[PDB]
Structure formats: structure tokens, C-alpha cells
Amino acid sequence: VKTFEDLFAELGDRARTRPADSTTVAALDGGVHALGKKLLEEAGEVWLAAEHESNDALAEEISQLLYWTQVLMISRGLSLDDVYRKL
Template identity: 35%
Template sequence: MQNETLQGLYEIVKERKENYEEGSYTCYLFQKGLDKILKKCGEECTEMVIAAKNQDQEELSNEMGDLIYHMMVLMVEAGLSLDDVGAVLEERRQKTGNLKKFHVVDKNS
């Protein structure tokens, strides 16, 4: 996935929030508010999981695209930029190979 594709989509989503356009699904989501946006993110996430479980590559790609789009709507609604999320991903990329130590619970106590 190219960075310019993500940036271009983000800019369109941001524009739709700032300027209502009749018939725009993105505008509809912003009009309905955070609860609707979160509901759609949850639905798309679930559909992505099912597609992955079914090992359907084409459907998985479609559902991942849907999830990323709805996540972008959420990002704009929450006032986050691609740079905000990109900084977190870059930080994680720098940590590649560093296995985190997980808290071990003593089930005998």
C-alpha cells in the first residue's frame, strides 16, 4: 500500500468532515456521529476476522480496505492525523525483534 494512497484517502475523508457533500457516505458517518463510526469499525473488524478465518484472500483484502477506511473516518473524527499514527508505527518498527516480556501469573496463589 502506497503512502500517497493513504494520504489521498485521508485528505478526502478530512474534506468531507469539513464540507458536507450530499450523497456522501463519509458525510453520513460524520453526521451520525461517533457511535455510528465506532459501530462500523467494529462491524468491519469482525468481517475481516471472518474472511481471514475462511482463508478467502480476496474477501480479506476487501474487508481490510473497509476497516482501514472506517479507521480513517475515526481518526478524522478524533482529530488524529496520519502522522500521529505513523509515529506510533515507526516507533514499533524500530523495536522489531525486541520480544516483550509478558507478565506471568502464578496460578497456584
């Protein structure tokens, strides 16, 4: 993945076409409450790695946080531009 926007396109595609094999689809189907839960937990994990783990370890956790953030966006029907206009 080369951009934040490439990831979003890919996740949106999963949301649309609903591949049976997709953990993304399951997560969307699990609903917003569970998505917020996951996002928060991952924030904690990012903090843990920020203080105690290697760059590689932190990059991994940050990548997961970004993932859940975009899944959350999709579940509430937010576009990239909806967020991008606020940055």
C-alpha cells in the same frame, strides 16, 4: 487510491466540504459511538474472511476496516502524523 495518505486526504476533503451525496458525511454526522460500532463489526468481518474467504474477499473487508479507521480519526480530529508517530 495509491496510498493510505491519499485516502485520508480524500476523506478529510469530504469532511470539510460536506458533499450532500456523501455516505462519509452521514457517517461522521452519526457520531463517534456509531463509528466505533462500525469499526468493531468490520473487524469481525475481517476475521471471518481471514479464516474462510478468498484473498479478494479479505482485501475488500480490510479496505473497509481502513476506511472506518480513518473516518474515526477524522471524527476525533486526529492527523495522519498523530498516528504515524506511533508506528
